[PDB]
Each structure stands twice: as C-alpha cells, then as structure tokens.
Design an enzyme around this catalytic site. Structure first.
Site, PDB file in Angstrom:
ATOM      1  N   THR A   1      -5.271   2.688  -4.965  1.00 12.32           N
ATOM      2  CA  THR A   1      -6.505   3.466  -4.953  1.00 12.32           C
ATOM      3  C   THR A   1      -6.623   4.335  -6.194  1.00 12.32           C
ATOM      4  OG1 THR A   1      -6.316   3.510  -2.542  1.00 12.32           O
ATOM      5  CG2 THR A   1      -7.934   4.973  -3.560  1.00 12.32           C
TER       6      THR A   1
ATOM      7  N   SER B   1       0.816  -1.209   0.000  1.00 11.20           N
ATOM      8  CA  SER B   1       0.000   0.000   0.000  1.00 11.20           C
ATOM      9  C   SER B   1       0.853   1.264   0.000  1.00 11.20           C
ATOM     10  CB  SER B   1      -0.935   0.001   1.209  1.00 11.20           C
ATOM     11  OG  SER B   1      -1.456   1.295   1.449  1.00 11.20           O
ATOM     12  N   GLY B   2       0.437   2.240  -0.807  1.00  9.26           N
ATOM     13  CA  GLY B   2       1.267   3.360  -1.195  1.00  9.26           C
ATOM     14  C   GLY B   2       1.969   3.198  -2.525  1.00  9.26           C
TER      15      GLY B   2
ATOM     16  N   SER C   1      -1.369   0.981   5.736  1.00  7.31           N
ATOM     17  CA  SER C   1      -1.441  -0.346   5.142  1.00  7.31           C
ATOM     18  C   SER C   1      -2.860  -0.878   5.276  1.00  7.31           C
ATOM     19  CB  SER C   1      -0.449  -1.284   5.820  1.00  7.31           C
ATOM     20  OG  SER C   1      -0.565  -2.594   5.301  1.00  7.31           O
ATOM     21  N   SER C   2      -3.483  -1.219   4.154  1.00  5.86           N
ATOM     22  CA  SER C   2      -4.805  -1.830   4.190  1.00  5.86           C
ATOM     23  C   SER C   2      -4.693  -3.282   4.623  1.00  5.86           C
ATOM     24  CB  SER C   2      -5.480  -1.731   2.825  1.00  5.86           C
ATOM     25  OG  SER C   2      -5.699  -0.382   2.462  1.00  5.86           O
TER      26      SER C   2
ATOM     27  N   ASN D   1       5.391   0.790   7.244  1.00  4.73           N
ATOM     28  CA  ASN D   1       4.450   1.513   6.401  1.00  4.73           C
ATOM     29  C   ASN D   1       3.408   2.227   7.243  1.00  4.73           C
ATOM     30  OD1 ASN D   1       3.431   2.512   4.039  1.00  4.73           O
ATOM     31  ND2 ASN D   1       2.861   0.528   3.163  1.00  4.73           N
TER      32      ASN D   1
ATOM     33  N   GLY E   1       0.002  -7.278  -1.106  1.00  4.86           N
ATOM     34  CA  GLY E   1       0.984  -8.137  -1.735  1.00  4.86           C
ATOM     35  C   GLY E   1       1.770  -8.995  -0.753  1.00  4.86           C
TER      36      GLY E   1
ATOM     37  N   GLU F   1       4.588 -10.493   1.490  1.00  2.00           N
ATOM     38  CA  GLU F   1       5.151  -9.640   2.527  1.00  2.00           C
ATOM     39  C   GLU F   1       6.202 -10.409   3.313  1.00  2.00           C
ATOM     40  OE1 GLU F   1       3.074  -8.336   6.329  1.00  2.00           O
ATOM     41  OE2 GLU F   1       2.703  -6.592   5.049  1.00  2.00           O
TER      42      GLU F   1
HETATM   43  N1  LIG Z   1      -0.517   7.874 -11.927  1.00  2.11           N
HETATM   44  C1  LIG Z   1      -0.394   8.638 -10.839  1.00  2.11           C
HETATM   45  N2  LIG Z   1      -0.530   9.978 -10.971  1.00  2.11           N
HETATM   46  C2  LIG Z   1      -0.409  10.747  -9.886  1.00  2.11           C
HETATM   47  N3  LIG Z   1      -0.163  10.385  -8.625  1.00  2.11           N
HETATM   48  C3  LIG Z   1      -0.035   9.054  -8.525  1.00  2.11           C
HETATM   49  C4  LIG Z   1      -0.132   8.134  -9.550  1.00  2.11           C
HETATM   50  N4  LIG Z   1       0.055   6.843  -9.075  1.00  2.11           N
HETATM   51  C5  LIG Z   1       0.263   7.017  -7.793  1.00  2.11           C
HETATM   52  N5  LIG Z   1       0.210   8.325  -7.386  1.00  2.11           N
HETATM   53  C6  LIG Z   1       0.414   8.844  -6.040  1.00  2.11           C
HETATM   54  O1  LIG Z   1       0.690   7.768  -5.176  1.00  2.11           O
HETATM   55  C7  LIG Z   1       0.462   8.229  -3.827  1.00  2.11           C
HETATM   56  C8  LIG Z   1      -0.026   7.088  -2.970  1.00  2.11           C
HETATM   57  O2  LIG Z   1      -0.914   6.248  -3.735  1.00  2.11           O
HETATM   58  P1  LIG Z   1      -2.390   6.010  -3.218  1.00  2.11           P
HETATM   59  O3  LIG Z   1      -2.919   4.614  -3.559  1.00  2.11           O
HETATM   60  O4  LIG Z   1      -3.251   7.109  -3.705  1.00  2.11           O
HETATM   61  O5  LIG Z   1      -2.255   6.043  -1.642  1.00  2.11           O
HETATM   62  P2  LIG Z   1      -3.425   5.501  -0.773  1.00  2.11           P
HETATM   63  O6  LIG Z   1      -4.545   6.490  -0.757  1.00  2.11           O
HETATM   64  O7  LIG Z   1      -2.922   5.267   0.681  1.00  2.11           O
HETATM   65  N6  LIG Z   1      -3.961   4.055  -1.431  1.00  2.11           N
HETATM   66  P3  LIG Z   1      -2.970   2.772  -0.944  1.00  2.11           P
HETATM   67  O8  LIG Z   1      -1.751   3.323  -0.110  1.00  2.11           O
HETATM   68  O9  LIG Z   1      -2.454   2.052  -2.148  1.00  2.11           O
HETATM   69  O10 LIG Z   1      -3.810   1.771  -0.051  1.00  2.11           O
HETATM   70  C9  LIG Z   1      -0.487   9.428  -3.929  1.00  2.11           C
HETATM   71  O11 LIG Z   1       0.140  10.611  -3.451  1.00  2.11           O
HETATM   72  C10 LIG Z   1      -0.802   9.526  -5.429  1.00  2.11           C
HETATM   73  O12 LIG Z   1      -0.881  10.877  -5.866  1.00  2.11           O
HETATM   74 MG   LIG Z   2      -4.950   3.508   0.417  1.00  4.25          MG
END
Ligand SMILES: Nc1ncnc2c1ncn2[C@@H]1O[C@H](COP(=O)(O)OP(=O)(O)NP(=O)(O)O)[C@@H](O)[C@H]1O
Ligand SMILES: [Mg+2]
Ligand SMILES: Nc1ncnc2c1ncn2[C@@H]1O[C@H](COP(=O)(O)OP(=O)(O)O)[C@@H](O)[C@H]1O
Ligand SMILES: [Mg+2]
Lengths: 139, 372, 7, 747
Positions: free
Chosen positions: D161, D156-157, D205-206, D202, D428, D430
């Site tokens: 999303t 995650s990150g 983390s989901s 992290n 993923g 881990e």
């Molecule tokens: N194609 C993209 N364009 C712009 N920003 C992106 C792109 N892909 C990823 N990011 C950035 O990636 C960062 C983290 O991803 P993001 O999934 O949005 O975090 P999240 O909300 O915590 N979801 P996740 O951490 O995967 O459970 C954010 O600041 C997004 O802006």
């Molecule tokens: Mg997220």
C-alpha cells in the site's frame, strides 16, 4: 661465505648482542639478515627459523654459529618497477594511497615506519617519484 | 465452446436438448402422418408428410404411424425424417458442429445400433456419437451408483440392477408390456361400456384419457367390490367434439394389467415379480442394497399410487426383515434425458465418443465393441 | 421383431 | 583453482541460514574439508556438491544484485543484509525487478527535492528508489503511449500500500494537479474492511487483487483514478479453517451491534453466528474492531456513500450472518424441511422484506421447467445446505462489486482519458503447513503472473542482446506451461474437480483416486505423497507444495437456484437489494471456474499493458525497525520468485561491464607490451589471455558479457598480483629501514 665474510658478519652480529652473551634472539635474526643485505620476507624468515612460536621467537637466544645456516639458507629489478607501476600514469603515486596499501596489505608495516621511509620523498602535491624512491632504497 | 446434443428416441415422445442444462427444450411425439383423403382445393401448400406436433394438430385427416415399436425402429425412412425435423426445426442446429448422444433399451437387436450409427455418421456427418442404456442414465439422473432400475416408457419395460457402477448383465430383465398395450387394452374395456375407438386419432384420444383418469388400486379386489357397490369412484371426461363420457372401474382396471399381464394374455408375470426375480438373480451380498434403492423411470410409472402398490406387494414377496424403499421422483418422466445430459457433460466422457475416424476405420461394427 | 413379436 | 587456501565460503547453519568461513586448506580431489570460522571445524564434501564460494568484497553491496559474480541464496541474502543494516537503504534492483524491504521506520528520502531530482532521469543514472520505477513508467508512456503497469507483490505487510502511495505522490508531484491521491488513499479503509481477513500466518491479508488506474489527459496531467478488483476469495465467506477469521467487516459489524442503529439488526456477539464462529478466533491482539468500524464509516462518508446506503450495506451483511444460522431438519433421505417458525429465518425475512412462507418454501425445494410443464421437487439436507451457502457467497460478491462501482463513481472525473498508468496490489505465492483450495488458487494465479514476468524479461533480454549485437540463441528461457497445463487443461486438476461436483456421490476420496489414475505416473510434476492417499504434490516454479484433497469439493461447489434470487429481487422494503441483484449459466458455475475466468480477465488487462515490477519482503516477524532475519528473508525471496529469477540469470550471462570501467579497474592487470590505442581491442586481447574460453564470455558493441563465475575469478588473480607487488615493496622498504638502523647501531 668466506672467512672474511664470516668475520664481518660475526662482528655485525655482536654489535646486535645487547646482553653480552654473544647471542641474538630468533626474532632479531631476520633483522640481522636484513642489516647484512638480504631482503627476506617475514614468511621466509619464519620458515628458516622453523615457524617458531611467539615465546621462543621472543626469548630463546642463538649465537652467531646457529644464526649462520639461516643466513646461508636465505642467501641461497624489472619486477620491482612493474610492482610500483601497479600503484601509479604520470610516474607519481599519492602518498595517502601508498601509505594505506603499505600499512594494510601484504606484510603490514607500522604507520611510523612508513612515515620514516616516506619523509623527504614526497613532493608538495604529495606525490612520490617511484623510480627515484626505488633506486634510493636499493643503493 | 461445442456442446453435445442429447436425444432420447423412446417410443411416443421424443425429447431432445443440449447437454449441460436441466430439461429438454424440444419435446414432441415421434409420429409421422401422411394425408389419406383426396385433396380438392388447388394451391393449398399441401405437403408430403407431417412430423410430431404438426401431425397431431392435423391428425383428423392423417393416418399416424409410429416408426418405433417396442423400442425397435421398424421403419427407417420415417425415423430419418424425425431426426431431420428434430435438429433443423426443433433445435435449429446443424449437426456437423455438435457430438450427439443417443439412447436405447437393452437386449434389442444388434442391427438397430448399427443402422442408428450409420445414419448419424453418413447423412448428418455428426462428428462423434455415443449410444447409452436408458436404465444406466436413470442412475446418473437420480444421483446414485447403486440400485435396481425399473423403467417403463411406451413400448419396452426393462429392469437392470447396478451395484457401485457395475452392471450385472445376466440379471437384466426385459418386458414388452408397458405403455402402448395398456392403451390397446383400455380401448377394449371401453367398448364394454359402449364407446368405440378404432382410428389412429382415437388411439390418441384414448391415450389422453389414460393420462388423465387412470390410477392404480392399492388392492384390486377391494376397489372392484367398491366400484360395483357404489358410484363414488366415477369420473367423466369431455371428448374433443364436446361429447362427454363417463368411466368407472375401467380407470383403475386398466393400469392393473401392469401387475397382472394375464389380462392382456401375455405369458409373463407383472413388474413386481420381474423385479424380485431380478434381485434373486443377484449375489446374496449385494441384495440388501438393491432392496434399499428402487428407482422408477419413464412415463408409464407416473400413475398415481403405483409406488405404494409396488412397495406393498414387493414387501409381501421379500424376506420380512428388510427395508423396501421405492424411489420415484416427480421428475422421473424425463430422468433418462437428464441423466444423459449429466453424462455427456462429464470430462472423463470425452474420451468415450465414437469418432468419425474410428467409424471410417472400422465401420459400424465398432459400435458394439466400443459402446456397452 | 423378426420372429416372436410382430415388430 | 576455484577453491584455495585463504578463500572464503558459505556453509549452512541453523541459527542464521548461511555462515561464512575461510578455507583453511586448499582443496585436493577428496572427501574432507578443513575450515576456519568467524572457530575451527572439519566438514565433509559428500552426500557431489561443493559449498557456495563467496564473492569478492568489491561486489558486495552493489546496487544491482546481478553485478554479483556468484549468485546464491547466501550471496543475495548477504547483499540485502548489508545494504539494509549498514547502508540503511531499503531499495535494490534485481534485473528488472525492484526489491523493497519494509523498514518499519520513517525515512527522509521521500522529500520533494529528491522527487524533483529523480524527474526525467533514466534508471541506470540514479541510485535505487521507488520513484525510479514510476519515472520509468511515466517516460515509457510519454514516449510510446502504451499504458503502463506497476506490479507489487509479496505477503501483505511487506508494504504494498505504501509503495503504491509513493507512486501516486510522485505522479501528483511531477505532472501538476485534482486531488486524486488523497481521495484514493481515503478509499483504503473500506476496501480493506470488505477485502482483508486474518490468516494463520498474518493479519490484514488482502484476499483480492486490487488494480488502480491513474488517468492522464493529452498534457499527461492527472485526470482521475479508476479502480477494479479481481480474484476475490469468495469461499472464505462460508468456511474457515482453524485460527482464520471471516472478512473483517463481519467482525467490525458484530462489535458495533450495541450501538443504537445496529440494534435494529438484532446481531449477536462475534461467535453467535455460524459464518463467524467456525474459525476459532473471534478476537485479534492490538485491533479494536469497534474502533475500526468508525474509520470505515468515515471512509464511506468521505467517498460520498450516504448513511442511507451505509445502513443498507450493514443490513445486507446482517442478512448473510442471520442466513448462516438457518438450519434444516431432514424428513427423509431425499427431503428436508425448515422446522416451524425458525427464528433465524424469521429475522432474515424481517431484515430483507420477503415473505417467510416463500423463503421457507424455496429453501427446501427446487424448481424445474420443461417448456410446457414445471415440477417442484424436494432436495436433500446436503443440497439445501450447499445452496444456502452458495446464496450467501453470491450476495457477498454482488455487494462487493456494488461498493467497488460506487467508489469508481467517486473517483471518476469527466475528461476523456488519454492514457493510464495502473498499479496492481496482488498477493504472492504462498505455502502453509496445510494447503487447501484457497492456496491452490493463489498459487495458480501466481503461476500465470510468473509466466508473464518470465516472458517479459526474456523479450527484454532479446532486445538487450541485439542492441549489443549478440545472437539471441545464447538467451535461454524457462516455461511454466507444463504445470499450467497440468492444473487447467482438459483432464486437469480443476477439470476433474469440477467433474466430481456433478458426479453422483462424488467425494474427496474418489476424486483423489481419479487424480492418481489420470496423472500419477503420466506427468512429471504431479506426485503422490508417500504415506497418504488423500493428498497430492505439485512442483511449482518456486517449490513443491502438498495439498490436501479433504476440503475441495465443499469449497468448489457453487450453484444458486433462480427461485431464491427471484424472491430476493422482489424485496420492496429497501432500495439497495434489487439494485445489487438486477444485473444465467453463470449461476451454475463452480468457484474454480469463476476464479479461472476472473484470472483470464486479469491476464487480458495485464497483457494489453507493459509491466514494471516491484517485489516486497517483510524482513522480521516482529516489526523491529531496521532489524533483519535471514530465515524469514530466505522464505520471502522464494515467495516472491526472486530466487528462481536468480537461478535463471545465473545461467547464461548475468554479468555485464562497459569497456571503459573494465579498463579503469584493470590497467593493473596487463603490461604495456599489449596495450593498444584501441582500448576495446586491448581488452579483447586481455581476456583472450586471461580466460581460457570464449564460451564463458562474449564481446559486443559496448559491453562484455561474462558467465556468472568469471569476474570473481579475475578479482582473485588481480588481488593476488596486487599483494605480490605490495609484499616485495614493503619488504624492501623494511630492509632499508634495517639498513639505517644498522648505521645507527654502528653509531
Ligand atoms: N518506505 C517505507 N517507509 C516507511 N514505512 C514503511 C515503508 N515501507 C513499508 N513501511 C511500513 O510497512 C508497514 C506495513 O506496510 P503497509 O502496506 O502500509 O501495510 P498495509 O496497510 O496492511 N498494506 P498491506 O499489508 O501490504 O496489504 C507500515 O507500518 C508502513 O509504515
Ligand atoms: Mg494493506
Ligand atoms: N402423466 C402420465 N400418466 C400416465 N401415463 C402417462 C403419463 N404421461 C405419459 N404417459 C404414458 O406413457 C407413455 C409415454 O411414456 P414416455 O416416458 O414418454 O415414453 P418414452 O420413455 O418411450 O419416451 C405413453 O403411453 C403415455 O400415454
Ligand atoms: Mg498499512
């Protein structure tokens, strides 16, 4: 080489003597060989020269007698055509592409040498008849 | 999936159910009744014989047999009826589909296990079965790997020490005192107060009186002095017909025969001296950790005050400097079943079953070598 | 039983 | 030969995981290697291995990682590195998988014109983009009307999303409209707040798998969304390892506590409570939890959960936190009691509308029913503590399922759904320095997901072979099933784990002993660590992972006594609590069993469907825009299983060329003796000459399939021929210029 050949070659060598001491530089030896009808690669020239270092290649001077064994060693068509057909299928070659490959692959030449040799050999489209250019440069 | 059946034959009550749940869903007495009186009415639906709660419901007319006496199966033709009734009527399950787990007292005759296996493979076609010691199952029930188990149901009393899951077979004691021969004694003392109970139905009335009113005296001679000197101790019970009977020292005096079997006239010493003799047959390094766990099992141990009577006189036998701890959970009547319910749900135990292939190969003799 | 006790 | 003077090779390096060299001498078979570097080195060939041999530059940077004619950690890492840094592209295809690299920067590519440009194309047509996968899903559905999965995986990150958000934005843009996308996106702050935790590596983390379905009508217009969840990590509610928090909502709630409404909950600070306190780390850098609370309540309000319900949810979470402070005094080895007027239990009852006297009775006792008769008997302080924590877990899981159902109520719309396309955010594979029951479950779910991926890609390769009329038996396959059976079969690690819970005086020590008895020499993938008796090693598809036994029994124990929930059901103080509970063997299930079932429901939901795959990587630890670190990337390519996909593809036939593109490249190669009016037969003759054995390559209907090495070898020999020709030409040209210069010298 016979006596006549040795005399003609020595005369030519002396024409390349720009200091009057009867000698040329190692780095000019290849040029003299090419002026006398040989077509050695830079690698072959350095090999017959003994892979000289930059300093002795640029400033150590040799007379005709020392040059001669090197000329001998260097001295002792269909491939050229296929080599040009590599870069063709209407019998032409782009001037930009030939310029790029001659200035960027192999024993790279300067852009000025390529401009000089290509002058008058390219047509209005910028295409070179390579069979004619080859015959011309071999004549 | 498929789930083991768990059955405890006992004496008196049968208790049966599926492995992996917390109490048995069939419990009923292991009793077979045959009608003796002449039948007059025509087309009554009159029947060969009754089993369990049927027989006790109608027990006025019947004669009641027990097929298991002193943990030995004495009659097989009745016992097959009792199992048939358990699976088809009580559990409503076909025994082809479930492995079965069966329960027994130690040091009973070999052929009991042979016949008990042979009937389960040949008539029921049970796909796999195991036979387990009651005492061992009481540890699985109470959650220990260490202790000396004192177990008494109807019929046989037995003691087994276990130390970190190794049984110590030379120190197993067995005694025939418990449960039925308390009731046969209670009849004989009740006659001294002027009431006479002979028939097999009256034996069930006496058994209910015993279950309601008996309790173990902390000191037997003090309380006999009191009950001679007083009426304060005296309790009354209403027979099924509404006659009322009044009972004094007899109610504590009956279970005292567990501690002094000379009253009924056996040779051997009471449960406390067989417990202490059992620990004495164990090697001196373990003994502390058997004194620190004593586990009571089976319904004859349900009498009020029996725990502190044990702790009190065992302490008087034992070396003075040690903990004696008596463990007697209120659930203990079902402990052997609950322990078999736990055991049959272990994953390791699924290699342990005698399978039908193995019986066909070896014949019922296999039960001795494969089982404990 | 078979000898000593009755069952 | 493979290695020659002026070759290039990759050699390992500490600072950047692989560094390039030129090979300064030809290889001679044997021990010593002379290398020249980006500056002069000698290197040993011996521990036999030879160093990974670099691809020709025409293949470097190509959109498809299987276009590479050597496949390695280094070649993949380099292709991704140059595509990210020099191209500023974030999307790349490996086989079926799309790899997405989080840029931490905004890009113009998402513009509506480009969305319309992708619409209706195939994949091969158009340069890699996330819209390409949604487009393939949409047209696969239109054709064949099986529902579609899109699956997004990685730590995650890595951007899972936003990769979902763009797919929603695509379907909403193409199909026409119904305002699903904005409403679904507005759901995220609550499903995070209940579902996301800190972890040692992290933040956010989901800890659960989130499945969104987008529904379509018979026009294939968007009806609505549906949402499901799977694999919730319940055990985190009651236990944390060092430097882990509880689920965010507990801390956001604690940081609210001074605000007027929550004062009625009598909350302490974030580390007053046993369930929040344990981890060590009540505060996080750069997160104002009290602020995020506001966004959580607002995301409730926009999905139509009234403050009547909202204060119910927060009352229940205060319930759990106060419940955790309840503490038992043992009054025997077999019995315990709650010391009189215990203030945590008093506040828990005042919150939950139950009698103090019956909570206090049922917490210390458990009740058993024969048909005729019931016994109430004590339990040890250890079972009382276990049962309290199982109640707290069971409340939490019910509250989570209720909040999910209300979000489904908001998102559902009336039309009967013709079909759906469904997008799965899941964690993923881990590994941390310490690995524990959470990591064991995550890695087992990721082994079932990997088994799906590996079988789907095999099936698609059997189709692609016979479309090209090639015998399937060449196609090779790889199987997780020996490891899956190791974990989940009868007498498996989970089986003996669930056994050791019921066993008398079971413990982690005798459990480890039972594992070593059952598996240690009898199975190939299970290994005992050399110097320890309290750990084991599983060889997973990606990697070996060492698990400690130390925690698992206290995490895997769950049983909930009916009398406690039968007290909670009684509560008539407030609406929500019996609405949660109202809903028998399941109350006896362990956590490992509930997880294995939830994973079977997930695997059923996916096997119904046809998948499509996205993998995400997080290219640097520190969120710097368009900067790359090879030492994270090499980790995350393993954590996403890409590198085993590459090891699978590199065996067999990774490289594919159309005859026409091949002949276009390689007219240079072959003389006109051998060209024919059939280009296909011409190229067959060419390869019959120029590769010694058909074993390395096959011909089919329209394409040539080569084993991994072959194309780079051909590029060697083609480049060396090309330079030979250049050399002879340029030397003759220079010689003629010497002839002219000699004529000038004569003048
Ligand atoms: N194609 C993209 N364009 C712009 N920003 C992106 C792109 N892909 C990823 N990011 C950035 O990636 C960062 C983290 O991803 P993001 O999934 O949005 O975090 P999240 O909300 O915590 N979801 P996740 O951490 O995967 O459970 C954010 O600041 C997004 O802006
Ligand atoms: Mg997220
Ligand atoms: N609550 C009780 N108090 C005293 N005696 C009891 C009680 N319940 C059963 N008994 C007696 O104990 C015997 C039944 O014990 P039980 O454990 O059912 O035997 P088994 O272990 O063979 O099934 C009978 O003699 C019965 O009268
Ligand atoms: Mg984000």
């Amino acid at each position: 080489f016979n006596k006549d050949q040795l005399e003609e070659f020595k005369e030519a060598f002396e024409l390349f003597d720009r200091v009057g001491d009867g000698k040329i530089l190692y780095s000019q030896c290849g040029d003299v060989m090419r002026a006398l009808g040989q077509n050695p690669t830079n690698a072959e020239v350095l090999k017959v020269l003994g892979n000289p270092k930059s300093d002795e290649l640029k400033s150590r001077r040799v007379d005709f007698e020392t040059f001669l064994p090197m000329l001998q060693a260097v001295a002792k068509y269909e491939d050229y055509l296929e080599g040009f057909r590599v870069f063709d299928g209407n019998g032409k070659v782009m001037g930009a592409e030939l310029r790029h490959v001659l200035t960027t692959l192999g024993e790279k030449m300067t852009e000025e040498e390529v401009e000089t040799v290509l002058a008058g050999h390219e047509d209005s489209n910028g295409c070179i008849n390579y069979e004619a250019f080859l015959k011309h440069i071999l004549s | 999936e498929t789930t083991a059946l768990v059955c405890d034959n006992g004496s008196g009550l049968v208790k049966a159910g599926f492995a992996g749940d917390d109490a048995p869903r069939a419990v009923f007495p292991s009793i077979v009744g045959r009608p003796r009186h002449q039948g007059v009415m025509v087309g009554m639906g009159q029947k060969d014989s009754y089993v369990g709660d049927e027989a006790q419901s109608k027990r006025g007319i019947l004669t009641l047999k027990y097929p298991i006496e002193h943990g030995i199966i004495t009659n097989w033709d009745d016992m097959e009826k009792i199992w048939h009734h358990t699976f088809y009527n009580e559990l409503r399950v076909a025994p082809e589909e479930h492995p079965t787990l069966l329960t027994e007292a130690p040091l009973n005759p070999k052929a009991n296990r042979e016949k008990m296996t042979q009937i389960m493979f040949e008539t029921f076609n049970v796909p796999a079965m195991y036979v387990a010691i009651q005492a061992v199952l009481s540890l699985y029930a109470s959650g220990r790997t260490t202790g000396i188990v004192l177990d008494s149901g109807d019929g046989v009393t037995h003691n087994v020490p276990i130390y970190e899951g190794y049984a110590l077979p030379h120190a197993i004691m067995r005694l025939d005192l418990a449960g039925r021969d308390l009731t046969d004694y209670l009849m004989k003392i009740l006659t001294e107060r002027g009431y006479s109970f002979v028939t097999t139905a009256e034996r069930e009335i006496v058994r209910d009186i015993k279950e309601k009113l008996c309790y173990v005296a902390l000191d037997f001679e003090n309380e006999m002095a009191t009950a001679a000197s007083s009426s304060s101790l005296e309790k009354s019970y209403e027979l099924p017909d509404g006659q009322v009977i009044t009972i004094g020292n007899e109610r504590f005096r009956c279970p005292e025969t567990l501690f002094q079997p000379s009253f009924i006239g056996m040779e051997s010493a009471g449960i406390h001296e067989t417990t202490y003799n059992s620990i004495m047959k164990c090697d001196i390094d373990i003994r502390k950790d058997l004194y620190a766990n004593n586990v009571m099992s089976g319904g004859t141990t349900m009498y009020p005050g029996i725990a502190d009577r044990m702790q009190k006189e065992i302490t008087a036998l034992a070396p003075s400097t040690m903990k004696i701890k008596i463990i007697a959970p209120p659930e203990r009547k079902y402990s052997v079943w609950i322990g078999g319910s736990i055991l049959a749900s272990l994953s390791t135990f699924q290699q342990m079953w005698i399978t039908k292939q193995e019986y066909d190969e070896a014949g019922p003799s296999i039960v001795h070598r494969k089982c404990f | 039983w078979x000898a000593x006790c009755p069952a | 030969e493979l290695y020659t003077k002026y070759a290039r090779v990759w050699i390992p390096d500490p600072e950047e995981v692989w560094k390039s060299a030129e090979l300064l001498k030809d290889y001679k078979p044997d021990k010593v290697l002379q290398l020249r570097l980006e500056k002069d080195l000698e290197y040993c060939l011996d521990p036999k291995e030879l160093p990974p041999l670099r691809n020709p530059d025409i293949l470097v940077g190509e959109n498809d990682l299987t276009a590479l004619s050597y496949l390695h950690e280094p070649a993949v890492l380099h292709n991704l590195k140059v595509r990210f840094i020099d191209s500023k592209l974030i999307y790349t295809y490996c086989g079926i998988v799309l790899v997405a690299i989080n840029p931490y920067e905004q890009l113009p590519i998402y513009g509506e014109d480009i969305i319309n440009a992708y619409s209706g194309q195939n994949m091969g047509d158009m340069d890699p983009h996330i819209f390409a996968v949604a487009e393939e899903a949409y047209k696969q559905m239109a054709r064949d009307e099986r529902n579609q999965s899109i699956i997004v995986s990685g730590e995650s990150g890595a951007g899972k999303t936003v990769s979902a958000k763009y797919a929603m934005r695509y379907f909403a843009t193409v199909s026409g409209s119904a305002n699903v996308e904005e409403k679904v996106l507005a759901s995220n702050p609550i499903m995070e707040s209940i579902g996301n935790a800190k972890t040692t590596r992290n933040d956010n983390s989901s800890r659960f798998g989130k499945y969104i379905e987008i529904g379509f009508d018979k026009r294939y217009r968007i009806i609505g969304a549906n949402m499901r969840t799977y694999l919730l990590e319940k055990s985190r509610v009651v236990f944390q390892a060092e430097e882990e928090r509880n689920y965010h909502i507990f801390y956001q709630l604690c940081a609210s506590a001074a605000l007027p409404e929550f004062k009625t909950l009598r909350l302490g600070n974030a580390n007053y409570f046993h369930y929040t306190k344990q981890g060590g780390s009540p505060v996080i850098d750069g997160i104002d939890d009290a602020k995020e609370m506001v966004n959580t309540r607002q995301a409730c309000t926009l999905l139509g959960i009234s403050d009547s319900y909202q204060m119910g949810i927060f009352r229940i979470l205060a319930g759990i936190l106060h419940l955790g402070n309840v503490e038992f005094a043992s009054r025997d080895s077999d019995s315990c009691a709650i010391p009189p007027k215990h203030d945590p239990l008093t506040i828990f009852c005042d919150l939950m509308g139950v009698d103090y006297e019956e909570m206090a009775h049922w917490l210390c006792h458990r009740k058993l029913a024969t048909a005729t008769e019931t016994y109430i008997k004590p339990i040890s302080k250890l079972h009382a503590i276990n049962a309290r924590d199982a109640l707290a877990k069971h409340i939490y899981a019910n509250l989570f399922n209720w909040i999910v159902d209300h979000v489904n109520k908001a998102l559902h719309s009336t039309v009967k759904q013709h079909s759906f396309i469904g997008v799965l955010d899941i964690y993923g594979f881990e590994t941390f320095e310490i690995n524990s029951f959470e990591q064991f479950c995550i890695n087992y779910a990721n082994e079932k997901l990997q088994q799906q991926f590996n079988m789907h890609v095999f099936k698609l390769e059997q189709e692609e072979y016979m479309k090209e009329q090639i015998p399937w038996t060449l196609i090779d396959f790889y199987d997780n099933q020996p490891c899956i059976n190791l974990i989940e079969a009868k007498m498996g690690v989970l089986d003996l784990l669930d056994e050791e819970c019921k066993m008398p005086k079971g413990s982690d020590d005798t459990w480890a002993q039972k594992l070593y008895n059952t598996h240690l020499n009898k199975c190939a993938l299970f290994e005992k660590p050399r110097l320890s008796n309290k750990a084991f090693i599983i060889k997973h598809f990606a990697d070996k992972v060492e698990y400690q036994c130390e925690g698992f029994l206290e995490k895997n124990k769950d049983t909930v006594y009916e009398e406690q929930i039968k007290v909670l059901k009684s509560s008539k103080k407030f609406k929500l609590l019996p609405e949660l509970f109202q809903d028998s063997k399941e109350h006896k299930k362990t956590v490992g069993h509930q997880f294995r079932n939830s994973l079977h429901l997930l695997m059923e939901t996916l096997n119904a469907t046809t998948p499509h795959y996205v993998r995400c990587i997080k290219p640097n630890d520190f969120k710097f825009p368009f900067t790359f670190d090879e030492k994270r990337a090499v980790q995350q390519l393993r954590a996403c299983g890409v590198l085993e996909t590459i090891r699978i593809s590199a065996a067999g036939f990774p490289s594919r060329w159309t005859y026409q593109e091949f002949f276009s490249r390689y007219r240079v190669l072959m003389k006109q003796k051998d060209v024919l009016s059939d280009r296909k037969q011409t190229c067959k003759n060419v390869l019959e000459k120029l590769i010694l054995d058909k074993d390395k390559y096959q011909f089919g209907k329209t394409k040539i399939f080569f084993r991994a090495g072959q194309v780079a070898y051909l590029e060697k020999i083609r480049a060396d021929k090309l330079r030979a020709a250049c050399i002879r030409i340029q030397k003759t040209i220079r010689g003629w210029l010497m002839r002219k210069k000699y004529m000038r010298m004569r003048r």
